[PDB]
From Swiss-Prot, chains A, B, C, D, E, F:
This is Alpha-synuclein. Cu cation binds at residue 14. Sequence repeats lie at residues 6-20, 21-31. Soluble monomer. Homotetramer. A dynamic intracellular population of tetramers and monomers coexists normally and the tetramer plays an essential role in maintaining homeostasis. Interacts with UCHL1. Interacts with phospholipase D and histones. Interacts (via N-terminus) with synphilin-1/SNCAIP; this interaction promotes formation of SNCA inclusions in the cytoplasm. Interacts with CALM1. Interacts with STXBP1; this interaction controls SNCA self-replicating aggregation. Interacts with SNARE components VAMP2 and SNAP25; these interactions allows SNARE complex assembly and integrity. The modification Phosphoserine is found at residue 51. It is found in: Cytoplasm; Membrane; Nucleus; Synapse. Highly expressed in presynaptic terminals in the central nervous system. Expressed principally in brain. Residues 1-31 are annotated as: 4 X 11 AA tandem repeats of [EGS]-K-T-K-[EQ]-[GQ]-V-X(4). Phosphorylated, predominantly on serine residues. Phosphorylation by CK1 appears to occur on residues distinct from the residue phosphorylated by other kinases. Hallmark lesions of neurodegenerative synucleinopathies contain alpha-synuclein that is modified by nitration of tyrosine residues and possibly by dityrosine cross-linking to generated stable oligomers. The chain holds residues 37 to 97 of 140 of the full protein. The 'non A-beta component of Alzheimer disease amyloid plaque' domain (NAC domain) is involved in fibrils formation. The middle hydrophobic region forms the core of the filaments. The C-terminus may regulate aggregation and determine the diameter of the filaments. Belongs to the synuclein family. Neuronal protein that plays several roles in synaptic activity such as regulation of synaptic vesicle trafficking and subsequent neurotransmitter release. Participates as a monomer in synaptic vesicle exocytosis by enhancing vesicle priming, fusion and dilation of exocytotic fusion pores. Mechanistically, acts by increasing local Ca(2+) release from microdomains which is essential for the enhancement of ATP-induced exocytosis. It is linked to Genetic alterations of SNCA resulting in aberrant polymerization into fibrils, are associated with several neurodegenerative diseases (synucleinopathies). SNCA fibrillar aggregates represent the major non A-beta component of Alzheimer disease amyloid plaque, and a major component of Lewy body inclusions. They are also found within Lewy body (LB)-like intraneuronal inclusions, glial inclusions and axonal spheroids in neurodegeneration with brain iron accumulation type 1.
Length: 61, 61, 61, 61, 61, 61
């Protein structure tokens, strides 16, 4: 492999924008919760995963 | 493989935009929950997955 | 491998913007919670994962 | 006039984006020239104009 | 006029973005020239203009 | 006029961004020239103009 004159963008995330005004979030009775916003994962060579969101709960009342 | 003059964008996510005004979110009785927004995963070479959202719950009342 | 004249951006996340005005967040009765904002993970070579959000809870009442 | 609870955006320009890669501009024999990019003009109360581009030339050869 | 609880954005320009890579500009034989980039003009109350680009030239050869 | 509780942004320009990589500019034979980048002009009350770019030239050869 060789690159003489070149621009290579491999495994890239850019220009991700989030805008929010007058919003409302309520999680009332949750055993375990994962609430997130932007999640950016850039990776050229991987063996596992990129983003893992796990939630295991128990709401007995 | 060789690139003499070239632009290669392989495995890329860009320009992802989220706009939200006067919204409302409620999760009332959830065992385990995963609530997210933007999830961007760029990866050239992978062996596993890219984004894993897992939720295992129990709402007995 | 060789690069004579080249720009290589591999495994990159940039220009991620979050804007929020007059918002409201409430987590009332949660066993374990993970609330986040921007999560940026750039990594060229990985063996594990990139972002792991785990929440295990118990809401008995 | 009165505003009790309100959001008023009057006379506004926002989120104007220009992206350009590998472009080419040539103005060879021009008497007078006006070459521009983004031109944003926000103004609530005006008596004149907003943007005036004037070019008066003479190419005799 | 009165504002009890309010957000007023009148005469505003924001979030104007210009991105340029590997570009080329040439003005070869111009009497008078005006080459510009971003031009942002925000003004609530005006009597004149907002942006005036004037170019008067003479290319005799 | 009165503001009891309020945020007023009148006559404002903000968040103007310019990004440029590997670019090229040439003005070869120009009588008078005006080459600029970002031009931001915020003004609440004006009688004249906001931005005046004037170029008057003479290329006889």
């Amino acid at each position: 492999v060789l690159y003489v004159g070149s621009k290579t963008k491999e495994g890239v995330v850019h220009d991700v924008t989030t805008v929010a005004e007058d919003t409302k979030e309520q999680v009332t009775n949750v055993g375990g919760a994962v609430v997130t916003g932007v999640t950016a994962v850039a990776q050229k060579t991987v063996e596992g995963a990129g983003s893992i969101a796990a939630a295991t709960g128990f709401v007995k009342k």
